[PDB]
Amino acid sequence: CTVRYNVADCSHLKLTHIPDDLPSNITVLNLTHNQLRRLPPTNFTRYSQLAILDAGFNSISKLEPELCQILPLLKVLNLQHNELSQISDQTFVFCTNLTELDLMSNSIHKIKSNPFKNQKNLIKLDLSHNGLSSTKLGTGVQLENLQELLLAKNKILALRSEELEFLGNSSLRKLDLSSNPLKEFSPGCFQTIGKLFALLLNNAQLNPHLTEKLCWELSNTSIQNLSLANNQLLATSESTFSGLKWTNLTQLDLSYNNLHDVGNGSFSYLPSLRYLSLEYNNIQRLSPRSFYGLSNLRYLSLKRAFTKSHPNIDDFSFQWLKYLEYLNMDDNNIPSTKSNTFTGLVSLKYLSLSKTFTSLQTLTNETFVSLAHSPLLTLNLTKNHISKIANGTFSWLGQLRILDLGLNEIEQKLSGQEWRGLRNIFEIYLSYNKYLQLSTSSFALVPSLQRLMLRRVALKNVDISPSPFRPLRNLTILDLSNNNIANINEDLLEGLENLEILDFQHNNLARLWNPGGPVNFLKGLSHLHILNLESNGLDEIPVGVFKNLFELKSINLGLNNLNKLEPFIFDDQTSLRSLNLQKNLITSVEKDVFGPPFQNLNSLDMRFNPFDCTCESISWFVNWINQTHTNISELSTHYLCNTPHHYYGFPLKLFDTSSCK
Amino acid sequence: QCTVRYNVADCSHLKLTHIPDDLPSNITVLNLTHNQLRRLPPTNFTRYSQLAILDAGFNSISKLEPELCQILPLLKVLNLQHNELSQISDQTFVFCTNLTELDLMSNSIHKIKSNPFKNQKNLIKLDLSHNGLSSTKLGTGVQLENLQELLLAKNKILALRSEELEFLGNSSLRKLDLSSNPLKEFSPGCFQTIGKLFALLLNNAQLNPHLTEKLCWELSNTSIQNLSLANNQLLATSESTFSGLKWTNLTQLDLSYNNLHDVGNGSFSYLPSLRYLSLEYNNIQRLSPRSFYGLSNLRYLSLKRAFTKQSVSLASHPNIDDFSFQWLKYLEYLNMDDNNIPSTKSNTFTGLVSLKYLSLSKTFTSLQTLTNETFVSLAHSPLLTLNLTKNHISKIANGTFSWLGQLRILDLGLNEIEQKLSGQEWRGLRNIFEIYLSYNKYLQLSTSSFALVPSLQRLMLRRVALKNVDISPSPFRPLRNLTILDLSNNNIANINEDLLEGLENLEILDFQHNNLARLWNPGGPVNFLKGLSHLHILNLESNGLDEIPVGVFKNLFELKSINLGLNNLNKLEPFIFDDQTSLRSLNLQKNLITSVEKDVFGPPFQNLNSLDMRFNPFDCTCESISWFVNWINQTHTNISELSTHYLCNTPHHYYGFPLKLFDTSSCK
RNA sequence: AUUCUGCGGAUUAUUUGGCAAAGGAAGCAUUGACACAUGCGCCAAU
RNA sequence: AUUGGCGCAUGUGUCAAUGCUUCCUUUGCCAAAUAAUCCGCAGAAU
Numbered sequence A: 001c002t003v004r005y006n007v008a009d010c011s012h013l014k015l016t017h018i019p020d021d022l023p024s025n026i027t028v029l030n031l032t033h034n035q036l037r038r039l040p041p042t043n044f045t046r047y048s049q050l051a052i053l054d055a056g057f058n059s060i061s062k063l064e065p066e067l068c069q070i071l072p073l074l075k076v077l078n079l080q081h082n083e084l085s086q087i088s089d090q091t092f093v094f095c096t097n098l099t100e101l102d103l104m105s106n107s108i109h110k111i112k113s114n115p116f117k118n119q120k121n122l123i124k125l126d127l128s129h130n131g132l133s134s135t136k137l138g139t140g141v142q143l144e145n146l147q148e149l150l151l152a153k154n155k156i157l158a159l160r161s162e163e164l165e166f167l168g169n170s171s172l173r174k175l176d177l178s179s180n181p182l183k184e185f186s187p188g189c190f191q192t193i194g195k196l197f198a199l200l201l202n203n204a205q206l207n208p209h210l211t212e213k214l215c216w217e218l219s220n221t222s223i224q225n226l227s228l229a230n231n232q233l234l235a236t237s238e239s240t241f242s243g244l245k246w247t248n249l250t251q252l253d254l255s256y257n258n259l260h261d262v263g264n265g266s267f268s269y270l271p272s273l274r275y276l277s278l279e280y281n282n283i284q285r286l287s288p289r290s291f292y293g294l295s296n297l298r299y300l301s302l303k304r305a306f307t308k309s310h311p312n313i314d315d316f317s318f319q320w321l322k323y324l325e326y327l328n329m330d331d332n333n334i335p336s337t338k339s340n341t342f343t344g345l346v347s348l349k350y351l352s353l354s355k356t357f358t359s360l361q362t363l364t365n366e367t368f369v370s371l372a373h374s375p376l377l378t379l380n381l382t383k384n385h386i387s388k389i390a391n392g393t394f395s396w397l398g399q400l401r402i403l404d405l406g407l408n409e410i411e412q413k414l415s416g417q418e419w420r421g422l423r424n425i426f427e428i429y430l431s432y433n434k435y436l437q438l439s440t441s442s443f444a445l446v447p448s449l450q451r452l453m454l455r456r457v458a459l460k461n462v463d464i465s466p467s468p469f470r471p472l473r474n475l476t477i478l479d480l481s482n483n484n485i486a487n488i489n490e491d492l493l494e495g496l497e498n499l500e501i502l503d504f505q506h507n508n509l510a511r512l513w514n515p516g517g518p519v520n521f522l523k524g525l526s527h528l529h530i531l532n533l534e535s536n537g538l539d540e541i542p543v544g545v546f547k548n549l550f551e552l553k554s555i556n557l558g559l560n561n562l563n564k565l566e567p568f569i570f571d572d573q574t575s576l577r578s579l580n581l582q583k584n585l586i587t588s589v590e591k592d593v594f595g596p597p598f599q600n601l602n603s604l605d606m607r608f609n610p611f612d613c614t615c616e617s618i619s620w621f622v623n624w625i626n627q628t629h630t631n632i633s634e635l636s637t638h639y640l641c642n643t644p645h646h647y648y649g650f651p652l653k654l655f656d657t658s659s660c661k
Numbered sequence B: 001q002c003t004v005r006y007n008v009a010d011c012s013h014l015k016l017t018h019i020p021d022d023l024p025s026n027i028t029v030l031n032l033t034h035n036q037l038r039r040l041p042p043t044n045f046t047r048y049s050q051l052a053i054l055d056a057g058f059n060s061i062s063k064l065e066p067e068l069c070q071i072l073p074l075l076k077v078l079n080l081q082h083n084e085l086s087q088i089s090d091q092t093f094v095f096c097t098n099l100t101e102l103d104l105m106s107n108s109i110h111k112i113k114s115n116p117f118k119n120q121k122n123l124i125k126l127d128l129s130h131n132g133l134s135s136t137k138l139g140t141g142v143q144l145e146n147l148q149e150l151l152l153a154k155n156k157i158l159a160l161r162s163e164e165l166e167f168l169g170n171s172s173l174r175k176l177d178l179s180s181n182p183l184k185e186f187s188p189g190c191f192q193t194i195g196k197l198f199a200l201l202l203n204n205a206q207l208n209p210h211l212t213e214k215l216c217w218e219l220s221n222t223s224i225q226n227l228s229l230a231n232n233q234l235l236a237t238s239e240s241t242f243s244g245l246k247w248t249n250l251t252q253l254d255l256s257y258n259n260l261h262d263v264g265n266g267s268f269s270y271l272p273s274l275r276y277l278s279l280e281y282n283n284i285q286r287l288s289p290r291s292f293y294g295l296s297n298l299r300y301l302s303l304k305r306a307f308t309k310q311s312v313s314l315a316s317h318p319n320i321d322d323f324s325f326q327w328l329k330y331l332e333y334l335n336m337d338d339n340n341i342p343s344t345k346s347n348t349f350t351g352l353v354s355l356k357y358l359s360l361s362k363t364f365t366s367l368q369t370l371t372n373e374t375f376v377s378l379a380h381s382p383l384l385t386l387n388l389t390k391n392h393i394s395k396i397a398n399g400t401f402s403w404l405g406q407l408r409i410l411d412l413g414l415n416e417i418e419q420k421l422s423g424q425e426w427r428g429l430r431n432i433f434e435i436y437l438s439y440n441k442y443l444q445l446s447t448s449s450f451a452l453v454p455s456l457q458r459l460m461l462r463r464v465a466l467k468n469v470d471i472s473p474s475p476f477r478p479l480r481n482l483t484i485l486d487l488s489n490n491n492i493a494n495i496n497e498d499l500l501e502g503l504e505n506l507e508i509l510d511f512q513h514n515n516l517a518r519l520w521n522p523g524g525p526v527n528f529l530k531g532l533s534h535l536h537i538l539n540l541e542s543n544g545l546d547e548i549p550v551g552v553f554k555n556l557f558e559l560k561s562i563n564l565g566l567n568n569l570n571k572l573e574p575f576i577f578d579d580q581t582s583l584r585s586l587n588l589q590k591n592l593i594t595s596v597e598k599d600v601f602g603p604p605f606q607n608l609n610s611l612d613m614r615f616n617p618f619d620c621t622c623e624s625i626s627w628f629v630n631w632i633n634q635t636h637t638n639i640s641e642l643s644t645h646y647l648c649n650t651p652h653h654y655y656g657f658p659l660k661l662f663d664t665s666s667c668k
Numbered sequence C: 001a002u003u004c005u006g007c008g009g010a011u012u013a014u015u016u017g018g019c020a021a022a023g024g025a026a027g028c029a030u031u032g033a034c035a036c037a038u039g040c041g042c043c044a045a046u
Numbered sequence D: 001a002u003u004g005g006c007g008c009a010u011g012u013g014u015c016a017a018u019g020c021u022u023c024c025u026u027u028g029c030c031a032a033a034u035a036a037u038c039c040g041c042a043g044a045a046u
Ligand SMILES: *[C@H]1O[C@H](CO)[C@@H](O[C@@H]2O[C@H](CO)[C@@H](O[C@H]3O[C@H](CO[C@H]4O[C@H](CO)[C@@H](O)[C@H](O)[C@@H]4O)[C@@H](O)[C@H](O[C@H]4O[C@H](CO)[C@@H](O)[C@H](O)[C@@H]4O)[C@@H]3O)[C@H](O)[C@H]2NC(C)=O)[C@H](O)[C@H]1NC(C)=O
Pocket: A330, A352, A354, A378, A380, A381, A382, A404, C015, C016
């Protein structure tokens, strides 16, 4: 086994009998994932210390009351996915300290007597998928403190004020009841539960009426959370959840319900509902009176909540949710915004509209007008096919901090105005578009920027002076990867005293490092930590173009053509933590070059290079390898030598430098 | 100094100040052209009394004394083009009676008095163009006995008279140029006065349909055969236009670049002898059946860019209708490239029963699909050549060529063909030589694609994105007489050895750019190239090749040229080349070759002509370049750039070191 | 038979990653064709 | 000098060809996950 400290962990051993050869000084034992005859109730003397046991996923026929008295110190008994066809009270009579009881696949079709007239400390109690046709587990009031009764994937037909009353002052925190083909909730079938907090009627085929009816039985109860996922509420009315009026409801779920109708004031009865999920549903539209009722709601989810003859929500439909702060509407077909869509949400601080529109080709200055009085900080607009953003398009989103226009068709030339009004904007994720010609003023209007992504946006004109990023001083993270940036003059990046992370992966910045003076890129970004120049056409790192970058933590120059390392390219990276020069054309590893960075390094990576197995080359290196503990992955396979003949395909590591010096 | 060398003393652009005359007197020619020349010292030519001709043009020569001709009695060619010589009289050439070629092109000699050449009796070529001549007259007496070329073009002649032309009595001109001359009138009998006038060139002379129509009669009863009318304003023609030629014997006629919009009926009814006719670069609206009535002798017709642009919006797409070529029963070469003709008609080419060469490259605009009724017209025409490149052809249905029985060379390249050849598209090409089919959209092949035409010698399939060439048998299975095969730039995914089975004549094979990389342990390497004993030049440049497996070049004795450039090949298992002992040129440039051993490159290096392995990561140690560096020192197999592009890549002290300068005196 | 358990093997679909290659495009460099200039020296006719 | 013909050399632009670098897309193969279906060995439950 893994014999993990204290807790015995036997993963998958294809084990035969119940073993007792390892330590006897422990409190847990994993036997799960093994072939088990039955549980020897007496073979548990050598282990009189175990507190819990991972004993599920085994072929266990039956169990004797013996196993509980042999291990008085036992809180968790895991017996899920086992046989145990039938059982009575005897089995757990000696388990009074038990707190978590697990039985998931034991097809225990019926239950007689009061089987747990003992467990007083048992909270979790999963009895699901076991063929139970009833909920009853006794006629007396037991299970003093139980907080989870899992009965789902079972075949219960109904609930009565009688087969449920066995819980008297019993207060369940989470009562599961999924997959049960319930057709009726006998009156007062909840008034009999001590105090019922959570509930889960997932996949139980509920009719708008069974639902409408069930509600009243959920009245005057301490119920706060309720799940109705995967049912047939093809529609709802004010009368549907009418029964809940007498309740105190926090979260309500109605996802995956092919809900086509969401009648008026259907929720007029939840003046306390704070959370509501309408995910994956087919709603036709939302008139203004749609949400009348939820005046406490703070999180609304319409992820894929509409039909696909296009569906749409009209103005002043959210006017009632004056306390909502998180509105999600991803994966949908809504045409476009209206002049008054989001009118009313004066608390909205997080809004997502990823792949939510179909005809919003152009972002106009009248698009987000609705969100004028909403304290909006987040706005995801990815995947909307947005191809052009006119002036003042965001002027109303005064307090916006994180805006995201990625994975879109934007093809225009930022002239600083598109950001007119983003007073305090944090980051602007703008990666993955068609074309983004920049100008000298593109960002002058928003100098509050910290992160600016521009991945695969085919940038053009970044060589103009001053640097279009000139006004972005508080800028820390900047990404210009996968743009095939033709070229760029040093002016760029001038004054970014905070630029920490910079990405240039894939940008043919090749020739910029002789002819016309080597572009002393990266001047003074003292604070620059992780630099990325992977696959950039780099063939020659010129003398000291990494000077004064003391705080530079991670350099990545993979996928390049770099064999000519002028001694001293790395000098100030004496704080470097991880270097990457994989898939290059590196022949030799000298000390004047890789020395200083190798100093306090954490993990190096130079696999797949044409290593030369001679002493003018790998000598200093092979040794460092033998005598350093800087994590170097695959040193064993992918560090082979390429020359000369006798040393071809020879693991670089196994090179005796005992004949060299 | 000059170049001299063998009696033709050539002094190139030498910046020559004064006419130099050194010892190479034992010669017969001297080039002084392209140098700064004061004047020609008529006496400095004693040290050179042997010269037969002199390249003396493109120099600043003021004037010339009659002296230079008597100093060099042995003189046939006098080149004085692009020089000054403003004026001159008979004196200048009095001593040049042996002279046969006289050149004067840029000397602005505006007028000519007397009989300047009362001496030249052996002078044939006589170029006097761009010289400011306002007249053709060069004398009043009948001289220049035997002259075959009188070049007077780019001049300012206003007309030709039976008077200023008569100075040629029994004089028979073979080629009489008269281009750029602003001629407005041809005084009657202005040719009846030339002994015998064969050729003529009135290029860019601004001729009216009438000046033309008129000029014709003066060209009558003359010995005229060729006539050029390029760059004029014959915006149209009628039967009456060339009516004056009826009294002639006309071989070739040119009317290119004439914005000809009208080609009236029977405009050529008068040329029962014209064999050649060029209507290139013109704007003809259409060709009714009666268009070509008259040319029953024509054998070569050119309509290259000969019909008006397509309007599309103005619906003015020009076109020729049926039975318009019925008269040219003797034509054998018809060209109609660069045009807007809509498409073929059921009877377009009807009548051409001699047509053996036909070109229709970029001739059609709406011929998206080749139907079985397209080339019906060419049914009775002995067609051997057919270029259809650049027509946007995207689909060729069954029996599309059935009528072209005798076709040998067919070309459907640079087209949009996107269909799957199922052997039927070639139904009827009884004796077809080559099928150039490169540069199309997609050509899915089947097991029968070529079974119908086993007469194939060459089959090109460059950049046609072939698909399914791995099917068995090889779709080329029935092509036995096939010699040249090209499957380049198709990114052929893969292929099994079956392919090429039985091509005992396959000599040239091209595989440039086809990621055939991994084919050389997936179920064993593919014994591609089995038994093509007769394969001469093999090309596998840039093919992903990273490992040439053991002996996949066995029995290829007759293989002359292997090209494996742009690949990743450093692992050469001794003996990959054994039977290429006849190899003449190897190419393994831009690879990842470390070392050159003898067990590997030995046999081919034997009788080799030219090797090429530049740009590789050469290792400057003896386990590697040792045997090689020597071969270099002691072999004379032409190896280009051995000096620069054969540097070493390892180790450190030998990096960037010319491979050649490696002393193997410390090894072996 | 219906199913639970452990281990191993197979096929398909979707997603990703790597390698090789193709097409098109971008930046830089080289070469050749041509056109519009310039400076130097020499000349020619006014 | 006005206009022109030469000789040498230096410019810009357009077009075309070639080479290096790169990017986007696609194709072949391979690897890893996830899911669906299946098959073999071993023990078992009603
Ligand atoms: C507005 O909404 C958008 C969606 O509605 C938000 O975008 C979503 O962001 C999440 C989180 O970034 C994305 O999820 C993962 O995206 C990448 C891509 O996955 C790739 O790696 C997988 C690994 O197995 C592959 O299987 C995939 O095929 C694919 O190639 C992942 O790489 C991320 O995982 C990361 O996991 C750890 C966590 O830090 C890292 O260590 C890893 O290195 C790795 O990077 C993401 O979890 C999600 O794709 C995207 N939406 C979707 C589903 O498309 C958008 O961000 C939001 N705006 C904001 C900022 O609020």
